[PDB]
Subunit: 139 residues, 3 copies
Amino acid sequence: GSFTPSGTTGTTKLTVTEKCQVRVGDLTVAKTRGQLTDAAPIGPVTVQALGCDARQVALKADTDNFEQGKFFLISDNNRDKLYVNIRPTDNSAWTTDNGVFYKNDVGSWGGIIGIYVDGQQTNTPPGNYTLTLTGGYWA
Amino acid sequence: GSFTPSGTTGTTKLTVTEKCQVRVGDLTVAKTRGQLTDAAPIGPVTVQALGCDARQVALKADTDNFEQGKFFLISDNNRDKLYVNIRPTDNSAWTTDNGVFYKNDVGSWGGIIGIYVDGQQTNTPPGNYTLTLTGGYWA
Amino acid sequence: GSFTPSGTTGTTKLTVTEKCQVRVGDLTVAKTRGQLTDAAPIGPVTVQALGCDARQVALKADTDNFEQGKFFLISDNNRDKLYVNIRPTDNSAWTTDNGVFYKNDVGSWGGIIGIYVDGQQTNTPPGNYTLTLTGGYWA
Ligand SMILES: O=C(N[C@H](CO)[C@H](O)c1ccc([N+](=O)[O-])cc1)C(Cl)Cl
Ligand SMILES: O=C(N[C@H](CO)[C@H](O)c1ccc([N+](=O)[O-])cc1)C(Cl)Cl
Ligand SMILES: O=C(N[C@H](CO)[C@H](O)c1ccc([N+](=O)[O-])cc1)C(Cl)Cl
C-alpha cells in the first residue's frame, strides 16, 4: 500500500486547440478538442525496470494529475483536466491505488504504457496539458 | 481586435556575451553584444497553420515580451530588453496590435517568421534573453 | 578574485535510485546509490572559449551548488547534496575560488571538464540531482 520513488520521470505533453491550429516552433503533440474522442490515443510511455526481480514495478502520477482514483492531464494553470486511461500494451495486470499504477506481479518489467482519452471530452479548453509519472515500486 | 489562443508555443532563445565567450554544454544560439547590430538576425520561427481558411493566423508574445507596440527579448531576470523586429520571410502582410502579430488576410498560412535586432544595441548586458510566441488567430 | 558572466550555461543532471531502477520516458543519466563510489564519473562538460586570449576562462556554479570551497550536485528540493570533483581531462591547471573554477592561465581554452563523485556516497537518497555551471572569465 506504499510507493517508493526509485526511477526517472516521464512527461506526457499535449496541446489542445480549436479547428484553426497554429503550430509554432518545433513539432510537438497537438490535437483539436474534436479529436479528444473516447479511447483516443494521447501518447506512449516507455518503461524499463532493472533489479526489480523481487519488487512490483510502479508509476506514480504527480499530485496534480490524480484524484478519486482517476488520472488526468492538467493544464499549465492547474485548472483544466483531461481524464485519461493508463494501460500497458501487453496483457500484463496492473492496479490503481491513489495516484499509483503498479504491476500485480514482481519482476523487472519492460514495456509500453499507453495514455488514452477517458470519455469523449471534445469540450476541453485549448491549452497545454501535462501528465507526469515517476518510476518506482510498490509494496 | 481580439486574439484567440489556438496553437503551440515557440521560444526564441539567445545568450548575449562579451568578447570573451565561454560556451558551456551543448551548442546554443549565442552572440557578443558587438554582434547586436541593427537588423542582425536572431533566429527563425516556423509557423504552420491548419483549418484556418476563414481565420487570420496570429502570434501573441508573452506579456513580458511587448509594450508600446514594441516587441523585445527579455533577460531571465525580466530586467533587460533586446528590441527586435518580427517579419515573415515572404511578401505577406501582417499587423501589430498590443503584443499581437496577425496576418492581414485569412487562410491556413505556412511560413517563416524572422527575428531581427531593432536598432544597434551593442550595449546589451550579457545574459539569457527569451521571446515567447503563442499560435492562434485574430478577429 | 572576481568572476564575470560571459558564456552559456551547462547543466549536469543525474537521477539516483535504489537497486530496483524504473526508467520512465527517454533515456537519461541514472545510477543506483551503490554506484556512487569514490571517483565515479558522473558526466563530461564541454567547454569552448572564444576571444579569451587575454582572459582566464572560468566556470561558476549556481549558489546552490557550492559551499566551503566544495562543489556538489543538489536534489530538486535543495536538501540533498552529492559532493563531486571538477577536473579537466587534459593537464591544464585550474583553481577553485568560492564556487568558481577558473584556469590558471589566459587563452581561449577548449576542453572537457569531468564531474566525479567526491568520496563514497552510496547512502545518497534517491532523487534528481543537478549541477549548473555558467561560462565566463576570472580576473
Ligand atoms: O499512441 C499509442 N498508440 C499508437 C496509436 O496511435 C501506436 O499504436 C503506437 C504504438 C506503440 C508506440 N511505441 O511503442 O512507441 C507508438 C505508437 C498508445 Cl501507446 Cl497511447
Ligand atoms: O535567421 C534568419 N535568417 C538567416 C540569416 O542569418 C538565414 O537566411 C535563414 C533563413 C531561413 C532559415 N529557416 O527557414 O530555417 C534559417 C536561416 C532570419 Cl529567418 Cl531571422
Ligand atoms: O564521464 C567521464 N568519462 C567517461 C568515463 O565513464 C569517458 O572516459 C568519457 C570521456 C570523454 C567523454 N566526452 O568527451 O564526451 C565522454 C565520456 C568524465 Cl569526462 Cl566525467
